[PDB]
């Protein structure tokens, strides 16, 4: 079948004249770059805080995750545009409160709802985290004993999930994974919600820089093909088109959720990279149709 929802958001990175224009009159989901008009589900200016961005874009997915639906939030775009910052890939301990990203905020709300529903509980719920890195189209388990050893025919499921009981634990897995981490390197930190009969995932994806100079991009790219193939029901999904779509195969299924976060530079010198990132958003936006 089709995914439950495919959403696309854009976040303007802080300015160091911005090429990004937010029209005086708009629905808050539009922007203009190099005279081109872009329309997505969310358009966040450089002034949007982490809290607001998380509340608008990710918080809604928390209930879905708890209900058993697979969820994926993926940041993409040029290096230095705030992808890691937005997703919260840096160990929480060494981060100021207002700067905390999506990962720590999501985990916080997950624990809260799990503790609030652990009495009108059917079964018990346990939370875990996995940290996978894709270096040159090769999956690596950053939480295992061989973080520098490629995976095959098992990166889809067989990969260490470490227990999560508090933010401190998240800090541990992020610190551990970061150390065991080694010309593109993508990161996929997944919050796993497991019960005796259910397993839902919240995949927080932080892709490597999309700038140029199979083709650097290709994942997400491959992601759009997957989204389309499912809609038109090609009765064969190109999951193996890339390591990204292979690792997230279990999450790229019917009544799963996919949310894109395009991070863009407001600098004129990055116009070309920004346009590339926004054009991809438009394409993923069209592929999200029929879903
Ligand atoms: N919205 C923001 N608010 C404050 N600082 C930011 C913001 N976005 C990016 N930064 C800072 O800019 C730098 C690069 O952010 P980063 O996420 O590492 O870019 P990327 O991961 O896309 O290559 C880091 O210092 C980050 O804290
Ligand atoms: Mg980064």
Swiss-Prot record:
Subcellular location: Cytoplasm, Cytoskeleton
Kinesin motor domain location: 5-285
Residues reported to bind ATP: 77-84
Tissue expression: In adult female, found in meiotically active ovaries.
Role according to the record: Required for the distributive chromosome segregation of non-exchange chromosomes during meiosis. May be a microtubule motor required to hold distributively 'paired' chromosomes at the metaphase plate until anaphase.
Similarity comment: family membership: Belongs to the TRAFAC class myosin-kinesin ATPase superfamily. Kinesin family.
Miscellaneous section: The nod(DTW) mutation is a cold-sensitive recessive lethal mutation.
The name this protein goes by in its record: Kinesin-like protein Nod
Organism: Drosophila melanogaster
Residues of the full protein shown: 4 to 318 of 666
């Amino acid at each position: 079948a089709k995914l439950s929802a495919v959403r696309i958001a854009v976040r303007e990175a802080p300015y160091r004249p911005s090429v990004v224009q937010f029209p005086p009159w708009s629905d808050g989901k539009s922007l203009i770059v190099d005279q081109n008009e872009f329309h997505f589900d969310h358009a966040f200016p450089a002034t949007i805080s982490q809290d607001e961005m998380y509340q608008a874009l990710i918080l809604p997915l928390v209930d879905k995750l708890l209900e058993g639906f697979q969820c994926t939030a993926l940041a993409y775009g040029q290096t230095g545009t705030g992808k890691s910052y937005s997703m919260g890939m840096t160990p929480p301990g060494e981060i100021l409160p207002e700067h905390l990203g999506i990962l720590p905020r999501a985990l916080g709300d997950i624990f809260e709802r799990v503790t609030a529903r652990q009495e009108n509980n059917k079964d018990a719920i346990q939370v875990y985290a996995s940290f996978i890195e894709i270096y040159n189209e090769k999956p690596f388990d950053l939480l295992g004993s061989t973080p520098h050893m490629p995976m095959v025919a098992a990166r889809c499921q067989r990969c260490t999930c470490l227990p999560l009981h508090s933010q401190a634990d998240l800090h541990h897995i992020l610190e551990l994974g970061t150390r065991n981490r080694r010309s593109r390197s993508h990161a996929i930190v997944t919050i796993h919600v497991k019960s005796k009969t259910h397993h839902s995932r919240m995949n927080i994806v932080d892709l490597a820089g999309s700038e140029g100079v199979v083709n650097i991009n290709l994942g997400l790219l491959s992601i759009n093909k997957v989204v389309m193939s499912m809609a038109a029901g090609h009765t064969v999904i190109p999951y193996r088109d890339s390591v990204l779509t292979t690792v997230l195969q279990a999450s790229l299924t019917a009544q799963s959720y996919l949310t894109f976060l395009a991070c863009i530079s407001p600098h004129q010198c990055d116009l070309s990279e920004t346009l590339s990132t926004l054009r991809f958003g438009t394409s993923a936006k069209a592929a999200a149709l029929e879903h």
